[PDB]
Amino acid sequence: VAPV
Amino acid sequence: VNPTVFFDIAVDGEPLGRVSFELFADKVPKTAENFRALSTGEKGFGYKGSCFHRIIPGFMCQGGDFTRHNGTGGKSIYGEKFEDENFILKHTGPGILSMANAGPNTNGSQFFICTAKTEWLDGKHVVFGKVKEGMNIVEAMERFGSRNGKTSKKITIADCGQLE
């Protein structure tokens, strides 16, 4: 998703 | 002038191939330097031995969590977190190298390689590089992914460093  | 870094990818310990990246130090020097130094291991920590925890076909391959190996960790060469330098570059399509984050100014070490255009990420994620060689190897890594991101086989950066 591209978060951490 | 723009540095080039390489990742030697392995699948379950078996060598797959090499992906090389041009880092846009002209446009995003601080973000580029973080990735470069993490790839060289100069600061004593970095991507060597790390894995790609989330690979979604038709979206992206995410990695850079060298601390917890699952997306909850990673650290920058400038402390735990650093600011979003700028958003000059956009997610134009496959090959784009951009920073993962947990919100504004939360960049650490986690990054993603886009396997499609991700224009919704424009202005929220800092684009700092692109795949120069080995997009074919990224496509090969993508086939070990799944809709939820879980890898069918362990995709690891067996070796990494700076070319030229």
Author numbering:
A (entry chain C): 1 to 4
B (entry chain A): 2 to 165
What does the paper say about this structure?
Here, we identify peptidylprolyl isomerase A (PPIA) is required for NRF2 protein stability. Mechanistically, PPIA physically binds to NRF2 and blocks the access of ubiquitin/Kelch Like ECH Associated Protein 1 (KEAP1) to NRF2, thus preventing ubiquitin-mediated degradation.
Pull-down using recombinant PPIA-conjugated beads showed that the intrinsically disordered linker between the Neh4 and Neh5 domains (135-182aa), but not the Neh domains, is required for PPIA binding. Among these five prolines, P174A abolished the binding of NRF2 to PPIA in pull-down assay. We synthesized a Proline-174-harboring hydrophobic peptide sequence (169VAQVAPVD176) located in the linker between the Neh4 and Neh5 domains and co-crystalized it with full-length PPIA using a hanging-drop apparatus. The amidogen and carboxyl of the PPIA’s N102 main chain respectively form hydrogen bonds with A173 and V175 of the NRF2 peptide. Of note, P174 is buried in the catalytic cleft of PPIA in a trans conformation, which may be the result of the peptide bonds preceding and following P174, tightly anchoring P174 in the active pocket of PPIA. The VAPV peptide displayed a similar conformation at this location as residues 3 to 6 of CsA, which can potentially explain CsA’s disruption of the PPIA and NRF2 interaction. In line with the complex structure of PPIA and PBM fragment, a residue-specific NMR spectroscopy showed that C52, G59, D66, F67, and F113—all located in the catalytic pocket of PPIA—as the most affected residues.
